[PDB]
């Protein structure tokens, strides 16, 4: 198994593990990643009965940056960018898995594009009458946030009295889980419950109680355009959504004790051409100004070592059934047809 590595601990991966696949346990799968993994990688996990991620240079560099991070300085913004289907989402997943094993508090947004398109229950906030709530999108995220960080929900406690309604309020000193529960039980207060959580996590992390990771995939949605409409068929701006408005505060480096990691995505983006992948093109002027200063990290296609190791992994899982696939000519043909693009290679190998 030249394409596998026995070191299943993300804190010990280095340049010598590049091109090798490490296994994520089912416990880690269900806890760390209820929602993170790409939809077409979950099919591979279900079919192979195992989740294995290749160790690549982008993830290694971003892990070396997070191992030497000073928690006294303001949080640093890391932005993964690259062409379509180059593996930036799975690099972010690798970094999230590294951070989870070191008892970090994980704030993982699997896809921020879902909050700016195709919303059927759009409401108007009682907290601020000029903003809109998205109870279905907020309550869905709250459940998975509870799943990922169930341990800390009782250790972390609020420092304010939050008033859900005249009858119900969360008193100072109650565990944060209660707030999450109030968002999970009554969807009407789900969006209000998300922001409070962020407001707490950004504050308490500054005090030094815990280390916080903000993992936002498809971050370019926040400073773009929405396809949501009012009842008068007028357009709605992203800042008019409370869910989007509160998540922008987390991207600002006005807090310390954590790191901000993000990944761009044109897939699912609104009003962007298919070939736009660079930071400014996808973010916009406003997005670049918001994230600036930030560290961009490039994710590229497979190099020959990574391509050979991925094909060996698929062969070890007996996933290439064509008789000419294991041969060398078939490998050259796959290399040319995919051009070493991970997503195209996976899709081509799916039906062979």
């Amino acid at each position: 198994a030249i394409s596998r590595t026995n070191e299943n601990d993300p804190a010990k991966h280095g340049d010598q593990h590049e091109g090798q696949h490490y296994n994520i346990s089912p416990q880690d799968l269900e806890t760390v990643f209820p929602h993170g993994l790409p939809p077409r990688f979950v099919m591979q996990v279900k079919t192979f009965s195992e989740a294995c991620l290749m160790v690549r240079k982008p993830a290694l560099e971003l892990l070396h940056y997070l191992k030497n991070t000073s928690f006294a300085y303001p949080a640093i913004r890391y932005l993964l960018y690259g062409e379509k289907g180059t593996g930036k989402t799975l690099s972010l997943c690798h970094v999230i898995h590294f951070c989870a094993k070191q008892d970090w508090l994980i704030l993982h947004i699997p896809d921020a594009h879902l909050w700016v398109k195709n919303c059927r229950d759009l409401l108007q906030s009682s907290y601020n009458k000029q903003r809109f709530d998205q109870p279905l999108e907020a309550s869905t995220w709250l459940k998975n946030f509870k799943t990922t960080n169930e341990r800390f929900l009782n250790q972390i406690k609020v420092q304010e009295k939050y008033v859900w309604n005249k009858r119900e309020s969360t008193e100072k000193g109650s565990p944060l889980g209660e707030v999450v529960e109030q968002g999970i039980t009554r969807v009407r207060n789900a969006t209000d419950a998300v922001g409070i959580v962020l407001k707490e996590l950004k504050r308490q992390s500054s005090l030094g109680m815990f280390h916080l990771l903000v993992a936002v995939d498809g971050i370019n949605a926040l400073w773009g355009r929405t396809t949501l409409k009012r009842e008068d068929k007028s357009p709605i701006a992203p800042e008019e959504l409370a869910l989007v408005h509160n998540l922008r505060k987390m991207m600002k480096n006005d807090w310390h004790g954590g790191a901000i990691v993000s990944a761009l995505s044109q897939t699912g983006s609104l009003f962007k051409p298919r070939k736009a992948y660079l930071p400014q093109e996808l973010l916009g002027k406003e997005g670049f100004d918001a994230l600036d200063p930030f560290i961009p990290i490039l994710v590229s296609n497979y190099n020959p070592k990574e391509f050979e190791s991925c094909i060996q992994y698929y062969l070890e899982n007996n996933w290439l059934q064509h008789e000419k696939a294991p041969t060398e000519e078939g490998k050259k043909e796959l290399l040319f047809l995919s051009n070493a693009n991970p997503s195209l290679l996976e899709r081509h190998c799916a039906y062979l």
Partner: protein
């Protein structure tokens, strides 16, 4: 046609050309020399020297195509292949140790065998001689039955009774049913073989 009669169809077979000259027969040597003089048509978009090329699946894709939308037809074909592959892998993971040796996981093998299991060798030919139509048995050529298997599979998958079930999912189910000599296409083959046996006395009209 925009090609003159002199133009000949191209031969895309890659290993044919690498044949050593020693192996060439005098007739094969002669035809190889003759092709030098002939004019050759441009190779059409489609077939290629790829080792993954499959003419049967290409013909199936062309037969599914509607309105020249070949991208959608190939998408449906690859989705069906992937669905069959995933279903067989799921059935393989849940099988006993001795049952895993008889579970085929190659979607191409399943596709070819399922189509071969539906090929009819005898058919009928409507022939009205005495003022009344008479269906007479006739042996089917190989191309005819290869076409009929594909046509029956596609028509069965196009039935409106399958409400909102997407074409890849229906086609994978029908292919896996025909792989095991089951389903309505195998029954359509059997009902043709039976209805042609019920009229073996009409072969004298041929």
């Amino acid at each position: 046609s925009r090609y003159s009669p002199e133009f000949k169809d191209p031969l895309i077979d890659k290993e044919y050309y690498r044949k050593p000259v020693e192996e060439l027969t005098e007739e094969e040597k002669y035809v190889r020399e003759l092709k030098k003089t002939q004019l050759i048509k441009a190779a059409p978009a489609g077939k290629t020297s790829s080792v993954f090329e499959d003419p049967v699946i290409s013909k199936f894709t062309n037969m599914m195509m509607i309105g020249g939308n070949k991208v959608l037809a190939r998408s449906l074909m690859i989705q069906t292949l992937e669905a069959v592959k995933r279903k067989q892998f799921e059935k393989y993971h849940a099988a006993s140790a001795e049952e895993q040796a008889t579970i085929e996981r190659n979607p191409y093998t399943i596709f070819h065998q399922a189509l071969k299991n539906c090929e009819p060798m005898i058919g009928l030919v409507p022939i009205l001689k005495g003022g009344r139509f008479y269906q007479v048995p006739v042996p089917l050529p190989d191309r005819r039955r290869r076409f009929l298997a594909m046509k029956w599979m596609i028509t069965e998958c196009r039935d409106k009774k399958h409400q909102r079930t997407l074409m890849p999912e229906k086609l994978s189910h029908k292919l896996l049913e025909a792989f095991h000599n089951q389903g309505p296409v195998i029954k359509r083959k059997h009902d043709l073989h039976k209805m042609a046996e019920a009229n073996r006395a009409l072969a004298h009209y041929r």
